[PDB]
Chains A and B, each alone.
Chain A
């Protein structure tokens, strides 16, 4: 139909909901859970307001065999329409550890109800990684320069989280933690700094060994992956240029304010230094009468 899924904002309510339904069907040992996603579309940001479970039994002999109740879906939707009438089918969540190619056929099934392009929201119920437990994808049709016809394939969508004003304050009520990824005080940004740098160091290591797997282990070659690395090399900063010399000059300026402010606080504290000592003299008189 269209691509309007450039941003996906996801309510925190939905993530919490997903784990609750996963356990209350008790799908383990590589069993899946699928529920509908309700919310807005026709907006570049896709708003994930709500979800609800659909009964869905997933096979263990194959991944190509599943039961899904089509009649169930409409009933859930008309009820929730009564609550708020801005909710329509915008996709379905898969709760597997990662992505499958038998989700493509399911995606096509939900294309019937939608008037948008179905969002596959892989809600991870394993809480892997320190970052988001959500990757998002939408099924899109392409041809490609290899000689490949009429492909259906999932293109990653960057994932973001927004919350409403009422929704956000509920989190704050529930939690009081201070968050190892926070950028707060001096000690906290110091920890963020070293954490952020090592974050990049991990991802770059993967690419290097991924490149080997193409050219000795025959993983597929794709121009989307090679093209992105090209961009990195082309817009890479350079030092020893007249940009670098201005940085250093900007750098003295910041070191200058720090040095001024260091001296400023020595004055204030030295004032306190005196005043403790005056108070001592007065209290000596008091102690002698005492």
Chain B
């Protein structure tokens, strides 16, 4: 939910929203989860936020086949 609603959101805010313990703790969550593709995002470790990568419009890709 947090990733869909806020495209770019610092881990700091997620801690506030979902009461996670620290920046690290949620970092680990996302890191494991995107290997599975659940969240479908990429982390910005230097800038301190999660940047979502879902954008859509695969009627330019070859996906429909």
Contact = CB atoms under 8 A, between A and B. Distances in A.
Instruction: Tell whether any CB of A sits under 8 Å from a CB of B in the complex.
Output: yes
Contacts of A245: 60
A267 to B, nearest CB: 23
B46 interface: no
Contacts, number: 12
A255 B64 contact: yes
Interface in A214-255: 245, 248-249, 251-252, 255
Contacts of A256: 64
Q: What size tier do the contact residues of chain B reach?
A: under 10
Nearest to B61: A248
B59 A249 contact: yes
Interface residues of A, number: 7
Q: What is the interface of chain A mostly: helix, strand, loop, or mixed?
A: helix
A249 B60 contact: yes
A171 B51 CA distance: 73
B65 A255 contact: yes
A162 B43 CA distance: 71
B62 interface: yes
Nearest to A245: B60
A90 to B, nearest CB: 55
B64 A252 contact: yes
Contacts of A249: 59-60
A252 B60 contact: no
Interface of A: 245, 248-249, 251-252, 255-256
10 contacts: A245-B60, A248-B62, A249-B59, A249-B60, A252-B59, A252-B62, A252-B65, A255-B64, A255-B65, A256-B64
